[PDB]
Design a protein around this ligand. Structure first.
Ligand code: HEM
Length: 372
């Protein structure tokens, strides 16, 4: 019950196939069925991402930022060109050397947590692991993680100005870090501008922060209440890939994402007006009972798992590779070093989605790690 994430979208998904929420005078029609979420994600002409910066997020961020995120807020065919520039950078976590460093980080944090005995997972464990792992993706010095940890779980400008500062440092003194690589990369034969680099870099910091922190935290909670799962991962390491994907499905750490409707049409026989917003509710699609057997359970070795936790079609998650390695390594490290857990005290993080109230994880959760 404590590690459970209920599906608040069930009645509405099965009856009408959509829901509605209000957000800053820009109301949202939420798509809830797997089939419709896929068809709409693929149809960028009708449901566009290339809007006024901030608009496709929920809550909308139009009032807090001006800079267009890349490739997130760009439509094809231009989307594919920016995407081809950055995609090899994001595939780097497939390399053995990168995975060794990450194994060493995660091993270290698990061992130190075994000495403390009990920790607050969200801040003392998940935030530390996420920040340290991000130094590898960005290829910055390890110590930069302390800055990111200090930020914790006008306010956005702290991030935007820090990004501006690193872009400036890297233009003066080019090195090997992601900033430097982006400034030297080419879009149709010219170098990316600082504004474009900022577009990629703000997105990169923001898209992987809460999502990874929630996946890591939710995974430990789950393993704490399912000793049989913990033992299966110890004795059957081959299922770990599938367990990670199943955890992304069930937890769906990015609940939903907007699009802007460009023309009058219908979805589920419900009309949607041009210039309004829809949402692709990945978390509802990933519980659809026409698609997943036992959808409200974690089936640890599920082979058939067409989930949309990392999106679908054009904008599918670029951080997916990084995230998957974090989680495969975490699950295996816990299985080889921890015998059991106990959850001592917690407070839930509930997303206020108007008629729907969605547990996405925990604001805090104290957990005891007992050693093997
Ligand atoms: C469990 C972790 C994560 C989940 C569940 C997740 C989920 C998603 C989802 C659903 C999308 C699709 C958004 C859309 O359709 O508009 C997406 C896109 C994206 N994610 Fe993630 N994400 C995660 C981790 C990361 C991390 C760690 C990073 C970066 C370090 C990252 C960077 C991105 C980027 C750059 C895109 C945009 C791709 C494009 O526009 O072509 N994500 N993510």
């Amino acid at each position: 019950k404590k590690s459970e994430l209920p599906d608040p979208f069930e009645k509405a998904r099965e009856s009408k196939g959509y829901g509605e929420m209000n957000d800053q005078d820009d109301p949202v029609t939420m798509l809830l069925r797997h089939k419709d979420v896929r068809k709409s994600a693929h149809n960028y002409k009708t449901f566009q991402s290339g809007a006024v910066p901030g608009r496709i997020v929920i809550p909308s961020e139009v009032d807090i930022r001006d800079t267009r995120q890349i490739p997130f807020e760009v439509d094809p065919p231009v989307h594919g060109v920016y995407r081809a520039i950055v995609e090899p950078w994001f595939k780097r976590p497939l390399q053995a050397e990168y995975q060794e460093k990450l194994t060493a980080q995660i091993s270290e944090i698990v061992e130190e947590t075994l000495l403390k005995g009990s920790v607050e997972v969200v801040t003392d464990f998940a935030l530390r692991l996420q920040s340290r792992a991000l130094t590898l993706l960005l290829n910055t010095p390890f110590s930069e993680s302390e800055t990111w940890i200090s930020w914790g779980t006008d306010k956005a400008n702290i991030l935007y100005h820090y990004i501006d500062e690193q872009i400036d440092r890297a233009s003066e003194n080019p090195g090997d870090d992601m900033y430097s690589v982006l400034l030297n990369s080419e879009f149709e034969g010219r170098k990316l501008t600082k504004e474009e680099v900022k577009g990629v870099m703000v997105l990169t910091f923001a898209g992987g922060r809460d999502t990874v922190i929630n996946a890591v935290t939710n995974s430990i909670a789950y393993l704490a209440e399912h000793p049989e799962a913990l033992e299966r991962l110890r004795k059957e390491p081959e299922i770990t890939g599938r367990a990670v994907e199943e955890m992304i499905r069930y937890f769906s750490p990015l609940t939903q994402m907007g699009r802007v409707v460009t023309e009058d049409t219908h979805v589920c026989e419900h009309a949607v007006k041009a210039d309004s917003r829809i949402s692709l509710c990945w978390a509802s699609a990933n519980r659809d009972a026409a698609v997943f057997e036992n959808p409200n359970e974690i089936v640890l070795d599920r082979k058939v798992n067409p989930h949309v936790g990392f999106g679908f079609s054009h904008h599918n998650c670029l951080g997916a590779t990084h995230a998957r390695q974090i989680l495969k390594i975490l699950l295996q490290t816990l299985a080889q070093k921890v015998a059991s857990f106990e959850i001592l005290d917690y407070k839930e993080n509930i997303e206020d989605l108007d008629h729907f109230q969605r547990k996405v994880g925990f604001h805090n959760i104290q957990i005891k790690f007992n050693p093997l």
